[PDB]
Design a protein around this ligand. Structure first.
Ligand SMILES: [Cl-]
Length: 829
């Protein structure tokens, strides 16, 4: 088409990311704005509020973000990188919506000759005045920097020699590096600040008077400090796994000191929080402190409250945590209600209001790799009834969760509700299928299906929370193929050990049995050196509401299922392996036929496609199944399927009508049929739910065969060549994945034409026109070396797509001028 027409239909943009960002390195939180901040090893800063409020930033240096400090009340924040640099970021309104932006940077440095291991920033303390940053260092000196000028103020330096000068000789036995471990402001006096050193000295420093008002020397090495709301109590945690409480009212003694976990040697408690409640029952929240010998490998946050203690246990390293308090600076009690934990592999939120401390569901930042992703499947425009039914069944399996509203709800989303409901399905290594609301900016989990059910498989007070599983339980459970019929609520899933399951959406529970049926693909042939078949449960099994399996087709050999097709109207299931393929009646639960493909691995069945088209006569069109193989062979099978009445009486019959060989012999990656207007045939039950999409039978039908090297069009029923595009011969690329995509014009509202969306082996995304097979546009998208990102890429029926930039995060892009799912929001004072 003309280039003017291309600009109405095609335009490439990467628009938003979905999931949990890879390798987080810092956590921040604004209590005034209720905004969550995540830093990564790559230098990214990601801000999150209410669903639809999102901000992605990137530091010019690719260094890890180690600290994030949102300024109190302000729409600004200060970050710190592992190269010891500070950065002032801002949220500025432009175009009626907020934008994240970096204002300036500053590297604290002493005189030349002074070692860097002395100016290394440990604690960053933004003063409540938002005009100054106090910076504790490894030397033991506290430096001051102006804001928003980012300039050092050497006249306000609080050195270690200046502090130790005001103190008695008993508290002057300093280390070479005093190591500022704590640096905090008085909760009820902006003139007083606390300074804590590694050896154990803590002081309260009069900023204006330049003198020590209070101090003590703890017996154990100091890790951290917490200052009670009223400023009249201090809590210190230490390297031997203990924590002490100190009154603030000269040099006092500890009120109480204890190693909370037995008499065994314990690892350090690295962080502690002491939060009051109006009920007179304080929370004690501390990180670590585990007995070294038998729990040194545990990642724990312990919560103490009202005689109840729980050591929350996470399957990955704690990057940072925060506790949401009801309070603002003026209140008397803290009144916590949520513990937010950023683990290296997931985000966990705990409800602190409800007894038992139940978890809170995530609206975003979901760890898609809780079990490793093994396949993906996107269904666009979901019928609203099935949508609500799947959502409802998801609520039924989430009873253990908290009823609390999502607390990180800051900001306002300027994006209207998604017009159509899009669904993304992910198959996982442990046999689970997760249903995701792929409609807009936030990828929210709606329902989880588990298929392992069809097979036969108190001090310290540890409580395992989170969902990330670092282990590989059983790989043969992994799901390779997914097919959801959005019209019938039927679902087919296929696994790594030849298991094929057909399921149906059920609003209520059931205790039915699952029919085991075998499909021997080597019937006309040999042994099997590999995985033994998954043993199925013989008796009836109870299933909670959702998609419930009623038949299991076990392939013999139990090899990887490499292709899957499901016709809901004809109630048939096609599936292929490296050996052959077969067709299965999921109404009669009986095998229709089986075909071995090891004599035209070139018999690897990679593509399956049902089509009601012209297979033998230009007047008679019958049901048909098409199979494409790695050797360039296309098998076509005529299908005699009875009507609704004789559906169980007489069986479905099938005969091999065609065997088409491609001379260039590239693997068949795509098969489809076009109607008399050169429009692709509609999905099963699509015509039954919309007669306006009835395929043209008056004109001749055409068969489209896409291989890794070429696009070929044949006419039906004769199968003689009419059109061709030799992709690999032209530009040296190979088709890795091809999907039909409807592209809409954005200068003419009621319009659209189908074309082929192509993912090449080089990570490019091309649009090949229908029906003439002319290359339209070529875009750079996935990197050539990113084999995993290419393997995971998946298209939508309307010009969008997803691919993995990491095990736990998708990137969303758009080929179409009709789609641009990007966040737009506003965060005000
Ligand atoms: Cl473009």
């Amino acid at each position: 088409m003309r280039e003017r027409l291309k600009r109405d239909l095609f335009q490439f943009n990467k628009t938003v990311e979905h999931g949990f960002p890879h390798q987080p390195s810092a956590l921040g939180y604004s209590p005034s704005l209720r905004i969550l901040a995540i830093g990564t090893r790559s230098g990214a800063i990601k801000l999150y509020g209410a669903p639809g409020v999102e901000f992605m930033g990137l530091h010019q240096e690719n260094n890890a973000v180690t600290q994030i400090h949102l300024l109190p009340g302000q729409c600004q924040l200060v970050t710190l990188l592992d190269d010891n640099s500070l950065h002032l970021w801002s949220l500025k309104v432009k175009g009626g919506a907020s934008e994240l932006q970096e204002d300036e940077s500053f590297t604290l440095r002493g005189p030349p000759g002074a070692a860097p291991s002395a100016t290394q920033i440990t604690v960053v303390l933004p003063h409540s005045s938002c005009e100054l940053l106090y910076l504790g260092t490894e030397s033991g000196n506290v430096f001051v920097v102006q804001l928003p000028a980012f300039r050092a103020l050497e006249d306000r330096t609080i050195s270690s020699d200046a502090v130790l000068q005001r103190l008695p000789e008993e508290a002057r036995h300093r280390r070479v590096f005093e190591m500022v471990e704590a640096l905090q402001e008085h909760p009820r006096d902006p003139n007083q600040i606390l300074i804590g050193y590694s050896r154990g000295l803590v002081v309260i420093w009069d900023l204006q008077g330049s003198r020590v008002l209070y101090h003590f020397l703890s017996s154990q090495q100091l890790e951290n400090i917490w200052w009670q709301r009223d400023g009249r109590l201090l809590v210190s945690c230490h390297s031997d796994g203990s924590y002490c409480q100190w009154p603030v009212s000269q040099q006092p003694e500890p009120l109480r000191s204890l190693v909370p976990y037995g008499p065994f040697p314990c690892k350090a408690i690295t962080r502690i929080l002491w939060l009051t409640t109006r009920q007179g029952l304080p929370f004690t929240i501390f990180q670590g402190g585990m007995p070294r010998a038998s729990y040194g490998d545990r990642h724990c946050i312990s919560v103490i409250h009202d005689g109840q203690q729980t050591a929350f246990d996470f399957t990955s390293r704690v990057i940072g945590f925060t506790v949401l308090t009801e309070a603002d600076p003026a209140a008397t009690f803290d009144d916590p209600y949520a513990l937010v934990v950023l683990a290296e592999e997931e985000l966990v939120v705990i409800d602190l209001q409800t007894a038992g401390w139940p978890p809170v569901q995530l609206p975003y930042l979901a760890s898609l790799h809780c079990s490793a992703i093994t396949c993906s499947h996107h269904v666009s425009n979901i019928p609203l009834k099935l949508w609500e039914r799947i959502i409802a069944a998801g609520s039924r399996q989430n009873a253990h969760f908290s009823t609390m509203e999502w607390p990180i709800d800051g900001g306002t989303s300027l994006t209207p509700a998604p017009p159509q409901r899009d669904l993304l399905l992910t198959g996982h290594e442990d046999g689970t299928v997760r249903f995701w609301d792929a409609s807009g900016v936030c990828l929210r989990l709606l329902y989880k299906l588990s298929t392992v059910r069809v097979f036969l498989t108190e001090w310290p007070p540890l409580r395992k929370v989170g969902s990330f599983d670092p282990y590989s339980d059983d790989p043969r459970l992994g799901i390779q193929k997914i097919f959801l019929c959005k019209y019938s609520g039927y679902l087919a899933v296929a696994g790594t050990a030849g298991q094929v399951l057909v399921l149906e959406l059920n609003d209520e529970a059931a205790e039915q049995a699952v029919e085991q049926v075998e499909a021997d693909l080597l019937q006309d042939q040999y042994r099997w050196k590999g995985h033994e078949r998954l043993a199925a449960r013989s008796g009836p099994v109870r299933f909670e509401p959702g998609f419930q399996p009623f038949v299991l087709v076990q392939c013999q050999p139990p090899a990887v299922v490499t292709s899957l097709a499901l016709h809901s109207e004809w109630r048939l299931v096609a599936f292929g392996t490296s050996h052959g393929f077969g067709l299965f009646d999921h109404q009669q639960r009986r095998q229709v036929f089986v075909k071995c493909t090891l004599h035209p691995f070139t018999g690897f069945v990679r593509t399956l496609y049902f089509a009601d088209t012209y297979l033998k006569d230009s007047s008679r069109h019958c049901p048909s199944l098409w199979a494409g193989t790695n050797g360039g062979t296309i098998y076509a099978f005529s299908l005699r399927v009875p009507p609704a009445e004789r559906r169980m009486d007489e069986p479905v019959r099938a005969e091999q009508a065609k065997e088409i060989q491609l001379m260039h012999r590239a693997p068949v990656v795509g098969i489809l049929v076009l109607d008399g207007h050169s429009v692709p045939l509609p999905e099963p039950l699509e015509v039954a739910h919309d007669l306006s999409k009835s395929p043209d039978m008056q004109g001749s039908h055409q068969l489209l065969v896409v291989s890794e090297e070429q696009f070929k069009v044949f006419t039906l029923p004769k199968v003689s060549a009419k059109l061709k595009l030799k992709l690999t011969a032209l530009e040296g690329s190979r088709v890795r994945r091809v999907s039909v995509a409807h592209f809409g014009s954005r200068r003419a509202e009621d319009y659209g034409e189908h074309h082929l969306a192509v993912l090449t082996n080089l990570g490019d995304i091309q649009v090949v026109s229908l029906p003439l097979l002319k290359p339209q546009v070529r875009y750079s998208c996935i990197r050539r070396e990113d084999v995993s990102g290419i393997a995971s890429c998946v298209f939508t029926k309307y010009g969008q797509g997803f691919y993995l930039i990491s095990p736990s995060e998708f990137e969303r892009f758009s080929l179409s001028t009709k789609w641009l799912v990007e966040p737009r929001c506003l965060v005000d004072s």
